Amino acid sequence: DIELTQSPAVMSAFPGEEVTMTCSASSSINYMHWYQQKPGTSPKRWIYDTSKLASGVPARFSGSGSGTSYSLTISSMEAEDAATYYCHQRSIFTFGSGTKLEIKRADAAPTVSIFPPSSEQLTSGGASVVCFLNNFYPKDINVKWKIDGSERQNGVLNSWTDQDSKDSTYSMSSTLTLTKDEYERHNSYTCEATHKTSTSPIVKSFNRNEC
Amino acid sequence: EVQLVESGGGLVKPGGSLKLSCAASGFAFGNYDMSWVRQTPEKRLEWVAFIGSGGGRIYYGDTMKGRFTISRDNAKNTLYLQMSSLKSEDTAMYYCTRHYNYYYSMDYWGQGTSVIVSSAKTTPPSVYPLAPGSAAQTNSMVTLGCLVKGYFPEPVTVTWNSGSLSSGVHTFPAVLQSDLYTLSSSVTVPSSTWPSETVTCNVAHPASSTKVDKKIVPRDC
Numbered sequence A: 001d002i003e004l005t006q007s008p009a010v011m012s013a014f015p016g017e018e019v020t021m022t023c024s025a026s027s028s029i030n031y032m033h034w035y036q037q038k039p040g041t042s043p044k045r046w047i048y049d050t051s052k053l054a055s056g057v058p059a060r061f062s063g064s065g066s067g068t069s070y071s072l073t074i075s076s077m078e079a080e081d082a083a084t085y086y087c088h089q090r091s092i093f094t095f096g097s098g099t100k101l102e103i104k105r106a107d108a109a110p111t112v113s114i115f116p117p118s119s120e121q122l123t124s125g126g127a128s129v130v131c132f133l134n135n136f137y138p139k140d141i142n143v144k145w146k147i148d149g150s151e152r153q154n155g156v157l158n159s160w161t162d163q164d165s166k167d168s169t170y171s172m173s174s175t176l177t178l179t180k181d182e183y184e185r186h187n188s189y190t191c192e193a194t195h196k197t198s199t200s201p202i203v204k205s206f207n208r209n210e211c
Numbered sequence B: 001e002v003q004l005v006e007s008g009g010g011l012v013k014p015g016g017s018l019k020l021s022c023a024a025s026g027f028a029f030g031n032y033d034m035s036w037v038r039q040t041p042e043k044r045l046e047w048v049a050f051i052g053s054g055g056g057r058i059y060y061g062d063t064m065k066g067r068f069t070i071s072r073d074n075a076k077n078t079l080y081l082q083m084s085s086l087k088s089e090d091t092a093m094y095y096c097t098r099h100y101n102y103y104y105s106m107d108y109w110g111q112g113t114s115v116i117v118s119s120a121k122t123t124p125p126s127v128y129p130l131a132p133g134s135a136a137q138t139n140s141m142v143t144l145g146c147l148v149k150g151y152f153p154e155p156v157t158v159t160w161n162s163g164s165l166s167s168g169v170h171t172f173p174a175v176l177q178s179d180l181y182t183l184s185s186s187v188t189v190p191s192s193t194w195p196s197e198t199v200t201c202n203v204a205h206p207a208s209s210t211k212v213d214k215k216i217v218p219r220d221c
């Protein structure tokens, strides 16, 4: 069962940098192909037969390799290059798992905002407290929830957007879902964002016994 | 010019069957080897089936195990995939692809048709307005939102003021919660414009044929 592994899984670079990613095969094969995919669209043939560029592919891209080791290289990378690149070869069932190339930019702190459960949701017996952490960089950010002063960890779901196609920031939602009855037994709700742009968290909060 | 257009995907119970189709345009369909490739929820790409130009040569991926049948009708420029005894692991986006030469790169791909294998039933979303309430903001900008909860399957489409508020919008990837999907969308507008100018989220769920608008109104405290 000849299998493909790709390294790195994820990498980020500023425009202008040289980029290299690798595709390794468990035994020797030839004529490796590379496919480019961006969110919400189909894979696209990018490099084929180890070194041939597909139509529309700039000469900054090159493919090379032999045996058990293949690589895709980009000179002077451009923002439009950001995508996942997958290797594959004619005898392989499962494509390589991909290298996702992301765009490095200047650090940015999130704009944070918190929302109490709506009265309409409460009527139905559930209670979601929503916190948005918008337009930040890098992707790694820590969200902490405190209810009446004690950290809370159960019932939180976080969802990050794909890197933003115009400004290269990320955004994320952090949602604390509770039963209406559990929500009604506590008062202070806090969402805290800790990001490497500051040693001090960004804090948004509300008291349920207001409004 | 070249077009490959898939159809036939949808929700199917485990153990069920489905037939996918791929309509081809813009090229001599019968001169080309064709394939089906699927992408799982984990973004893994798996070569499902391959068929030679004349329909007399066929290959299948390792986990197919006789449950898939690729066929083609060169007179109607259509490729098919019959799928049977479906399992949860067969949930994926199914792509029609065309082969260039005999090293078997795939030089054209269709748009994909989504197959979801589970016992869940189509369910419309609840949509809730997210106003600041007791978390009132005070800057030059204000951020509002909509919570979309409890629908199946993906996707929903969210717009704000019918697409006229397009900048300042973040619609987050949905996540499974009690085996149903939930997402939120945020919009940011000058604080001088709300509530004086109305802000409404527009939620569409095609699978359930549902369309709801939720006006974001200041809360009655």
Ligand SMILES: C[C@]12CCC(=O)C=C1CC[C@@H]1[C@@H]2C(=O)C[C@@]2(C)[C@H]1CC[C@]2(O)C(=O)CO
Pocket: A090, A091, A092, A093, A094, B047, B048, B049, B050, B057, B059, B060, B061, B062, B104
């Ligand atoms: C190049 C090849 C063999 C030679 C040929 O006339 C046509 C093809 C295309 C389809 C390929 C096939 C294989 O070599 C085995 C493959 C890769 C198959 C599609 C799925 C496959 O059956 C597997 O996934 C086996 O593990």
